[PDB]
Design a binder for these strands. Structure first.
Lengths: 145, 110
RNA sequence: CGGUGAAAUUGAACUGGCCGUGAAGAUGCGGCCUACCCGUGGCAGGACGAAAAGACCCCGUGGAGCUUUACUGCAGCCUG
RNA sequence: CAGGCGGUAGGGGAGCGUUCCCGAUGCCGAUGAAGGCCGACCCGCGAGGCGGCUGGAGGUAAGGGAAGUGCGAAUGCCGGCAUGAGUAACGAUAAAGAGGGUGAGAAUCCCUCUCGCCGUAAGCCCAAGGGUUCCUACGCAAUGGUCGUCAGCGUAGGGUU
RNA sequence: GGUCAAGAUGGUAAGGGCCCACGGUGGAUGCCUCGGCACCCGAGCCGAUGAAGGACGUGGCUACCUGCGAUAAGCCAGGGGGAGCCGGUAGCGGGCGUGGAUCCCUGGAUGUCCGAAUGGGGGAACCCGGCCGGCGGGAACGCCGGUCACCGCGCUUUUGCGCGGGGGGAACCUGGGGAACUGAAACAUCUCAGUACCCAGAGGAGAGGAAAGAGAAAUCGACUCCCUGAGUAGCGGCGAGCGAAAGGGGACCAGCCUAAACCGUCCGGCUUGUCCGGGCGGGGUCGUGGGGCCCUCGGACACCGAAUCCCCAGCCUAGCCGAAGCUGUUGGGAAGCAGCGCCAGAGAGGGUGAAAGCCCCGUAGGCGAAAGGUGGGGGGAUAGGUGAGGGUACCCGAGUACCCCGUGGUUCGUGGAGCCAUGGGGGAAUCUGGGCGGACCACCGCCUAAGGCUAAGUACUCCGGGUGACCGAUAGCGCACCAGUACCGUGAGGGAAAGGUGAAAAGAACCCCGGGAGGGGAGUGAAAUAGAGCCUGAAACCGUGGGCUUACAAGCAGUCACGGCCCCGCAAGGGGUUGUGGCGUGCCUAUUGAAGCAUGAGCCGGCGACUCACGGUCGUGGGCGAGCUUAAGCCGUUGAGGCGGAGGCGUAGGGAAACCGAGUCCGAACAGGGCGCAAAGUCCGCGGCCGUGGACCCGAAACCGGGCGAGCUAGCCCUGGCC
């Protein structure tokens, strides 16, 4: 019976009509009622087409794969891991499958600060990966179908 | 005050009223409880007709409205009405029992 | 005189002429000349009189009705 | 101390009532809910209290939430009420005047007496289509373009085989 | 005191102007409802035993609203039920009933005439007819009556006996056929869209519904509906735009069959032997066999989609109880202020003359109950019919698959364009069979087509119940109660208004002007400025009285000043009223621009227009940085929230890609651009804000669909008359 919205929250701009005294809202006739006019963009659309193109995604719906999920040895070792075996499987918490564009696809070796690899078998190890993987101390592996 | 009722010809009390002096309930409807306690009317200073004396002004005015009347009165006045325990083969006897009691036995009085 | 008892148009108006003036044809703003209160039966000038958001127009990459060997098809005819 | 403060379009800020939702119904109230009617304390305002009259029962907020909402104004929408107007108008230039009568009142009903216009129709007739009414008896506040004790008007009853 | 010359001021309204009092017509309207509307559950078929839907009837005395229909305010029987009823009329004039009367329900009976109508016709609701019965004056007449389409449907070819349908229905529903606008700011591909609408038809819900499927993992496994799947994959004057599918999360989870010659059986066949035809079957393919020969076989658990029957049949409408106060008291009132005493697994609400747990209410408390009409459950029985192993020459689910063009689907608009689907011509395979993944070819894989049946989970709303930061009589259904009727239109078709007197009728005897209305009194009563259109009852406009004011005056208005009146006043002074004067072009819209002579504007009153859903997007108020949770399952007066972890957004990105990767594509180039740079977002809200949706609001020419009319008018046809 008291806690009114703290700061501002509550209705901030449902400003009614056009002006305390006066009122009318905008320009001249060009924007009447049935006036949801030249929408998004006129000459901007000209641009839109304005150019040949080199990106063609043809008559279809069934592409292959080579799973590009950006994973980071940095989140890993900085503070959420097990320096030898984690595997795609163990990466749930990992913020490299817990987002959206390929959750379950493939975890690559964002080899960065300090070493730059992966000491846990898997798939996605930058070349830089293979190398600092070998330095950091890791057993990486990669079986198929 | 519905398809169901309170007392009938009965004999009862006037709480919120002007009389309280209970007495003969000459008639009581089914829906509008409309009941006449023969306890407060008028004259309708009649037609001027020979319907009433050629020189008229009806007398017995008695349409009893309000329902704050304290129906039923055993050796007890204001009391609700019980129901049954049957007791006998085929026994409704929704007689009135509370504190004192009265059921309007078909005898000595209604 | 008596019985009767409507109808558009219109801010409200108590609304002279002037010479002037003003968006450029004014009772209503300027300076000035006459002229009190009211009403009837008339006379048509103004108040752009009423009347209908001009059928003159323009304008609206508006509509609709012919048309023509404009554009595309439909019909029916002719035809492997 | 600056220092500024005409100012639509338009952009920013900040308040106003307004009917509902909690209203953690507080209740207030027949010594009145409410809307109303009037008023030289409150508000920089949108509003406020408060006083007085009406008026018959509601109404509601301390704090916050929800919105068919605040309107001259759109030849607007619906309902009133005005205006020329007590002038224009009464539906045909086929005219009517009297006497007595009945009546609460009769230019405007009834008889009867003078009189004009139809007559080739303002004739009768069948039919159509109307479908009450026709009659007889009461009545007129509505209706006839005022009348009106008259009616094809209102009330009732009977009426065509 | 009188005469004359001069000057200055005064009152005197027919009406009008501002102010005050008091009326009237007008209904705002505050509140108030047996009335809507919104969501959710319940419910979901009517009809020839001629229905839905109406015409004319009856109520002693009734136009009408009612219910019945000719046995007509109803008769019968059973279920229910407490003592009153002869519906809304209360009035008249008569009644039935505690030897369950009014009435609530379930099954009863005639059940007028119309309406599918059907015995025939016909402008429906009215006129005709043929058969047996009857009565009357017999025959002729004429009534009750039972009687007599049509359809296709199967049965005895002769019953033409015995069935079926048809006729409806607010919305949902399947297929049949199927359109312009508007967008694409033109517009012809395109678009709205397979949308509106005409139709046919099965239902109570149909729809679809056991795979020549998916999809590529050596995977799934009916069909339907929800969330997600991307609005990506993509379709395209690649433009406006349009836009999937497997999977995953969820819900709901039966699967079952027939001709399929072979068997034999059989009857008809033709014509006889050994072909076809049609009945019984075993076979009667579920994810593949089925049949016929040889051998191992085999001697009790399975119910349907109602197989089916009996039940606690859920209800239908009637049921029942059921908690505790009185004294006082201010009041016309109290249920109120006050006193003490009271209930509570039931302080949900309404109702009893102003606001009660203990007063009215058969409610929340809990419980109740029936011999009819409906079944899921739980279980039984009824159980058709399913339910083995190898061997062997094979014959045994469709008449067209398939391929040419002509077309439909589909996220496909013509394309390299696949699969299903059909209009033309071609024109076959039995499990080495044949369509399907990749136009197509070589593979593997997939499924088993060209028959059949149905449940269960999303839709829909006529009808019932309930709840509403959903409405109050101009909003709500237009419609709150003799509104889908008044009334306009030819028909099609359009389509109002009017809610409240009061607490209860005690609503007005009676006297008085009057033809009447209506007007003064008496009584009403708490009021009648509560008096019958009669609550609250304001603005507008017209009225009766009072104050100031007004006849040498030129001005929207006004209004600053002041002076004369009159007013409350203690004075201060405050009111209203103005004559003298100063200065003052009225407001809205669209205008370079308005006094307008440009416009809107008649006056009052109530209505009267920047929203909602998402997408988003930027802000900013709030939770953790990885942050947040749909569809559901579950607990839920209050119904209490909890859980549900298919996801989408982040978390490097760079590229047409191959990919590489914090690096990177160009590239043979150490030169640039996307960065690296986290400088964490992610979610909830509130809000400026676009995109789609009618998105400030009402506004047009018109285009398109389906119907409506020749008593419209011109024509033509038939048929009288008149000149």
């Amino acid at each position: 019976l008291r806690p009114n919205p703290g700061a501002n929250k509550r209705r901030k701009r449902v400003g009614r009509g056009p002006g305390s005294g006066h009122g009318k809202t905008a320009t001249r006739g060009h924007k009447g009622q049935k006036s949801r006019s030249g929408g998004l963009k006129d000459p901007r659309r000209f641009e839109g087409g304005r150019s040949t193109t080199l990106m063609r995604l043809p008559k279809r719906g069934m592409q292959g794969q080579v799973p590009g999920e950006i994973k980071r040895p940095r989140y890993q070792g900085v503070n959420l891991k097990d320096l030898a075996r984690f595997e795609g499987e163990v990466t749930p918490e990992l913020l490299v499958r817990a987002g959206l564009l390929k959750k379950g696809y493939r975890l690559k070796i964002l080899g960065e600060g300090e070493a730059k690899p992966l000491k846990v078998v898997a798939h996605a190890f930058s070349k830089s990966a293979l190398e600092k993987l070998k330095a950091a101390g890791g057993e990486p592996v990669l079986l198929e179908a | 005050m519905r398809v169901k009722m309170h007392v009938k010809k009965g004999d009862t009390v006037l709480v919120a009223s002007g009389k309280y002096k209970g007495r003969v309930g000459k008639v009581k409807e089914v829906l509008p409880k409309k009941y006449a306690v023969i306890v407060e009317g008028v004259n309708i200073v009649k037609k001027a007709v020979r319907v009433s004396p050629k020189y008229p002004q009806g007398g017995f005015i008695e349409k009893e409205a309000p329902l704050h009347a304290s129906k039923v009165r055993p050796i007890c006045p204001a009391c609700g009405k019980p129901t049954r325990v049957r007791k006998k083969f085929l026994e409704n006897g929704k007689k009135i029992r509370v504190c004192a009691k009265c059921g309007g036995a078909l005898d000595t009085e209604e």
